[PDB]
């Protein structure tokens, strides 16, 4: 129940309620930043490689 | 304070009497950074000081605070394996801070309803040398002498 649920979230057929977020790369359920559609983890992984445009390590 | 020695924080004089002492005393009254309320309660009492006696609240404050200045106290020096309560000097810094603290602490102890009415009475009895704040002073001084024996440990 990790793969089928991946096919289930991208499915979005039944009630708009039952649809939900799901990390685009890893496919996590929780911790889903909508802007990227990513999970906290990969979102962090990518930015560290600058693969995410304009995004930089904050510090003020 | 293992390193330096810490700078005794400085303080802007009173926006009225121009007295730094009063500025500090206000802070003790101050609850949760609400400095405005504190000053208010103080000055309200300040006028109440004259409302009762033909004297101005100025020297009433000094006379009072000066009677609550503990000459000597008991510091527990844990040397010789045991903890001896040695009597010794009170730094001029402490005498003030303690007096003011005891002043307000004893003031809050009073029963009367409004807060400024307490700072007034406590301040009066203090200068009169009779207040409950003075009672803590008379104590710490006696507690010091009730152990003058071990005073030969005064560092």
């Amino acid at each position: 129940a990790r793969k089928a649920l991946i096919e289930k979230a991208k499915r979005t057929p039944k009630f708009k309620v039952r649809a939900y977020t799901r990390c685009v790369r890893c496919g996590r359920a929780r911790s889903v930043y909508r802007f990227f559609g990513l999970c906290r983890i990969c979102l962090r992984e990518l930015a560290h490689k600058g693969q995410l445009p304009g995004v930089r390590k904050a510090s003020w | 304070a293992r390193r330096r020695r810490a700078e005794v924080r400085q303080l802007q004089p009173d926006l009225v009497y121009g007295d730094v002492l009063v500025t500090a005393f206000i802070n003790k009254i101050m609850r949760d950074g609400k400095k405005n309320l504190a000053a208010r309660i103080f000055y309200d009492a300040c006028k109440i000081i004259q409302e009762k006696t033909g004297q101005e609240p100025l020297k009433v404050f000094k006379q009072a605070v000066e009677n609550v200045k503990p000459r000597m106290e008991v510091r527990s020096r844990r040397v010789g394996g045991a903890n001896y309560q040695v009597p010794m000097e009170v730094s001029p810094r402490r005498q003030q801070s303690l007096a003011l603290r005891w002043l307000v602490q004893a003031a809050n102890q009073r029963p009367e309803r409004r807060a400024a009415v307490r700072i007034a009475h406590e301040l009066m009895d203090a200068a009169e040398g009779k207040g409950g704040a003075v009672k803590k002073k008379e104590d710490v001084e006696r507690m010091a002498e009730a152990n003058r024996a071990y005073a030969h440990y005064r560092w």
């Binding site: 802007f35 906290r40 983890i41 979102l43 962090r44 304009g54 995004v55 930089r56 | -």
Partner: protein, 98 residues
Amino acid sequence: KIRIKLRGFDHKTLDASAQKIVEAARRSGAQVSGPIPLPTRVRRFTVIRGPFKHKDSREHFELRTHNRLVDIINPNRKTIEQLMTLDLPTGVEIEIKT
């Protein structure tokens, strides 16, 4: 009459394109309101540094999205033609209004 917008993540690309429109628009056209720097927006993202149980110590980045504004008064054909096939930003966004 010419209100150009200039948004872009990298702040450096916006200064090159800012001058790129100042040169052509002014040196061959009417009045041009100097590059007005609009207030930058900021997208801060606080993420749990670890993949597992470890609240705090988390890292956080941000996504500075810039803004810049420039105006012009006259539609001199010299400028409309030049600033149409000579312009070429990169990650910058150019959107003009009347």
